[PDB]
């Protein structure tokens, strides 16, 4: 690159997607204070929405932003494959979604209470608040209950 020094376009804070972002942090690295966000799911989208990562956050003039989200709120009309995301086949309409909101907290419970409703042995574990994936439980995971 090379230095450049711009106007008071740069704003320190702006909330979006029900989440905050520091301006002084990278705009391919802040971007991950939402839920359902990975350093990887996010890296991809940016210059899929024709924006150059190299620069900071209270930057990068709003117009793109209004539909950088349209690419994550709608990621397969806009060319990202259905093994790159957190919910395929989802459980009950065979669709493939991403969830990134307080709705990720939500869609946890949706399935969590599913297995509970269904008597599945792994619900029972969860209801009892334990390790679910078959770890030995005597010596491990003791004091943060």
């Amino acid at each position: 690159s090379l230095v450049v020094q711009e106007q008071g376009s740069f704003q320190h804070i702006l909330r979006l997607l029900n989440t905050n972002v520091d301006g002084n942090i990278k705009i391919v690295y802040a971007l991950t204070t939402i839920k359902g966000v990975g350093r990887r799911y996010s890296n991809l989208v940016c210059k899929k929405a024709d924006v150059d990562l190299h620069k900071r956050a209270g930057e990068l003039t709003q117009e793109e932003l209004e539909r950088i989200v349209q690419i994550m709120q709608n990621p397969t009309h806009y060319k990202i494959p259905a093994w790159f995301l957190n919910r395929q086949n989802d459980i009950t309409d065979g669709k493939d979604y991403h969830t990134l909101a307080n709705n990720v907290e939500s869609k946890l419970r949706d399935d969590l209470e599913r297995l509970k409703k269904i008597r599945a042995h792994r619900g029972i574990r969860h209801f009892w608040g334990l390790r679910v994936r078959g770890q030995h439980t005597k010596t491990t995971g003791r004091r943060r209950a």
Partner: peptide, 12 residues
């Protein structure tokens, strides 16, 4: 646009 250049890598 994606590939990790192996399983063994964190990021592209």
């Amino acid at each position: 646009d994606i590939v990790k250049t192996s399983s063994g890598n964190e990021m592209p």
